[PDB]
Amino acid sequence: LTATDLARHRWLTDNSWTRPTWTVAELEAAKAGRTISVVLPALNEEETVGGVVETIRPLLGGLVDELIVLDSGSTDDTEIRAMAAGARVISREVALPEVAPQPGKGEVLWRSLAATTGDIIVFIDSDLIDPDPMFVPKLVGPLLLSEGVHLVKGFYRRPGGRVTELVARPLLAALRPELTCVLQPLGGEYAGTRELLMSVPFAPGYGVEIGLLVDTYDRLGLDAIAQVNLGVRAHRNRPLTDLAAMSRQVIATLFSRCGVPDSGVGLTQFSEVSLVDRPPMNTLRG
Amino acid sequence: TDLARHRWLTDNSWTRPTWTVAELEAAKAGRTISVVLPALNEEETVGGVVETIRPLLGGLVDELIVLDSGSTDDTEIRAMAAGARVISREVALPEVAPQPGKGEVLWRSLAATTGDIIVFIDSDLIDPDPMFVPKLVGPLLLSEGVHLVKGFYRRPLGGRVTELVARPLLAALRPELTCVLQPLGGEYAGTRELLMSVPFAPGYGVEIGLLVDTYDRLGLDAIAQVNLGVRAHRNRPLTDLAAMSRQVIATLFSRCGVPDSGVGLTSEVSLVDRPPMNTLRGKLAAALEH
Ligand SMILES: O=c1ccn([C@@H]2O[C@H](COP(=O)(O)OP(=O)(O)O)[C@@H](O)[C@H]2O)c(=O)[nH]1
Ligand SMILES: O=c1ccn([C@@H]2O[C@H](COP(=O)(O)OP(=O)(O)O)[C@@H](O)[C@H]2O)c(=O)[nH]1
């Protein structure tokens, strides 16, 4: 009944797949000379990083051209476990030597653009306990097969969370209502074209996902964004103080894209907030 | 900046209010106190809340009203049996058609009360305590310059909307107000001077709108907070919390001039305040300006 509703319905019809059952073989055949890089950001994920790598490794040399763990300064056994599991481990410093690192996830994903060569870049979190081998095929399907798509968001069915449903989706309803069609805007499993990703700033820390979604929308609208169901995953039960820090940075990043000033004041406890994006990687490479 | 917050907590926050009913009665100095419970279909709890306040009626408390918001259950009869006067939205402000939501109820109660101080207490509380009203009025009666008192609950050793939505948004847009522990709480008291003169946000936005307007107009030191006791976080469905969050966002955006689309969640979202009650009840308001 609203303009938002109407666009959502058609966008789901065209750009959302609850059964993204493309085969690896057909996706390989559709690459048409494009290459695919998979990047796992990792900070102290020794218990899970190898398991994630193991689910992607069978695609290496076929659908996937490179599988990189972009280490974020781990002090546990993340790097060596990623090595043994069959990934290429690259530090923030090796990825982009000319810029000093700053903390947070967004920095890692941004730097990975300088360390990878794929025409399509896929991000998968390294803290996943139950990774499924079809994540990468499902994420790249719309990029390889669907005209005009530059960003694919992977969502999970449940057997979003609190920040998604209380913070991100309500703020998008207020500020960019067409984007409320995206089921899991904060999700860490997603893929984009190099053309898109090199051309947008990267928000810091836990702002990176929402920043990329809004910057893509502001340039290209809903037509360029797709989503795919990766399967069933249970909600993680994270501490409220962590969720609040995430909510504060999601707010800061949304406000920075939507014309709202932000005090720069992090959370008052009885938190880390940065409004400093990294510039488009095109300004340094390519 | 934490110096501003530290000083406010030192002077304007009470974890253990010491006040007795007798000392508060003795401090009224001719001021009267109205207690208003908004109620929409609260038959299971409204009587218990009223019962905790009724012993104060005729002493500390001058009026005890349940503002019924269109209930179809036994809310009215049970509130009356417990000793409250029950006033419908229509009776409170008869010439203005009612609109839905909590903010409407609190706003209308201003036309149906005579107190120099108005105390709001939710009627859905499972474990009300008789010292709520004394604690909420203490800073209004015994401190100087306080106009709004927010009652907070200590938690066993705010909720999800408070900590993920309200506090982070205040950090971004009204940073001093992050010192308020439970900005969305429904137990609070205000002066007639303040409440009659501010617009009232609709629905679930009413509390945050009043907090921000008080802050802007009267300042941080006009706001106080008091610990009402230990209460466990209420476990509500996420969809309900999301609808509340969306309205909190809308009201804070209204108070900051952020274009809000008005688009709800696939939920009710209003961007329209009710005007200050002194615009519709000017003679009542003037009679109470004292
Ligand atoms: O500074 C950071 C923060 C996070 N991450 C990675 O980004 C993903 C999401 O991080 P989050 O903090 O949400 O999860 P957690 O680190 O608690 O598992 C995980 O794979 C982290 O290892 C990272 O590489 N650098
Ligand atoms: O339109 C409304 C919505 C709420 N309330 C009252 O305001 C308080 C807070 O409402 P909430 O919806 O949080 O509680 P619930 O109505 O779910 O018990 C309660 O005493 C409600 O009865 C009201 O009078 N009118």
Q: What is the CATH number of the domain that holds A200?
A: 3.90.550.10
Specify the residue with its C-alpha closest to ligand 2, atom 4: B102
Residues 6+ positions from A36 with CB-CB distance below 8 Å: A63, A64, A65, A66, A118, A119, A120, A121, A122, A136, A140
Nearest to A138 by CA among A229, A32, A233, A66: A229
Residues in chain A with CB shorter than 8 Å from the CB of B172 are 248, 251-252, 255, 260, 262-263, 265
DSSP state of A197: H
Instruction: Please tell me whether A219 is known to bind a ligand.
Output: no
Residues in chain B with CB shorter than 8 Å from the CB of A248 are 168, 171-172
Q: Tell if the CB–CB gap between A174 and B253 is shorter than 8 Å.
A: yes
Ligand nearest to the CA of B68: 2
Q: Tell if the CB–CB gap between A162 and B238 is shorter than 8 Å.
A: yes
Residue the block writes with tokens 């690459």: A31
Residues 6+ positions from B47 with CB-CB distance below 8 Å: B78, B79, B81, B82
Within 10 angstroms of residue B122's Cβ, the number of other Cβ atoms is 17
Nearest CA in chain B to A9: B266
Nearest to A114 by CA among A50, A65, A74, A68: A68
DSSP state of A46: T
d(CA A210, CA B119) in angstroms, rounded, equals: 41
Kindly report the backbone phi and psi dihedral angles of residue B284, in degrees, each rounded to the nearest multiple of 5, phi listed first. -55, -50
Ligand nearest to the CA of B268: 2
> Do B89 and B111 touch, CB atoms closer than 8 A?
no
d(CA A249, CA A227) in angstroms, rounded, equals: 23
d(CA A272, CA A285) in angstroms, rounded, equals: 29
> Do A183 and A213 touch, CB atoms closer than 8 A?
no
The side-by-side arrangement of strands in the sheet containing A120-123 is A16-17, A225-232, A151-157, A190-193, A120-123, A36-42, A66-71, A88-91
Q: Which phi-psi region, left, alpha or beta, contains residue A44 (left: φ > 0; alpha: ψ -120 to 50)? A: left
Tokens of A210: 């929402």
Bridge partners, residue A91, by sequence:
A71
B226 CA → ligand 2 middle, Å: 22
Gap from A70 CA to chain B (nearest CA, Å): 30
Measured over the CA atoms of residue A188, residue A190, residue A194 and residue A195, the dihedral's sign is negative
Q: Which residue among B35, B66, B124, B267 is best mutated to probe the pocket of ligand 2, counting the most ligand atoms within 8 A of its Cβ?
A: B124
Task: Give the relative orientation of helices B132-142 and B46-53 as an angle to the nearest 10 degrees.
Answer: 50
3 state DSSP class of A152: strand
> Do B204 and B101 touch, CB atoms closer than 8 A?
yes
d(CA B75, CA B88) in angstroms, rounded, equals: 11
**Number of domains making up chain A:** 1
Nearest to A224 by CA among A30, A15, A4: A15
Nearest to B221 by CA among B146, B135, B143: B146
d(CA B10, CA B241) in angstroms, rounded, equals: 32
Bridge partners, residue A16, by sequence:
A227
Kindly report the backbone phi and psi dihedral angles of residue B31, in degrees, each rounded to the nearest multiple of 5, phi listed first. -75, 150
Residues 6+ positions from A242 with CB-CB distance below 8 Å: none
Nearest to A36 by CA among A126, A109, A141, A189: A141
Domain that holds residue A81: 3-283
Tokens of B5: 């917050």
Gap from A175 CA to chain B (nearest CA, Å): 6
Q: Per-residue DSSP letters for chain B? A: -HHHHHHHHHHHEESS----HHHHHHT-TT--EEEEEEESS-TTTHHHHHHHHGGGBTTTBSEEEEEE-S--SSHHHHHHHTT-EEEEHHHHSTTS---SSHHHHHHHHTTS---SEEEE--S--SS--TTHHHHHHHHHHHSSS--EEEEEEE-----HHIIIIIHHHHHHHSGGGGG-S-TT-S-EEEEHHHHTTS-B--GGGHHHHHHHHHHHHH-GGGEEEEEEEE-PPP---HHHHHHHHHHHHHHHHHHHT---------------PBPPGGGTSHHHHHHT--
Method: X-ray
- Give CA angle at B273 (B267, B176), nearest 5°: 90
Instruction: Please tell me whether A190 is known to bind a ligand.
Output: no
Nearest to B205 by CA among B118, B275, B119, B270: B270
Bridge partners, residue A229, by sequence:
A155
> Do A67 and A135 touch, CB atoms closer than 8 A?
no
d(CA A56, CA A71) in angstroms, rounded, equals: 17
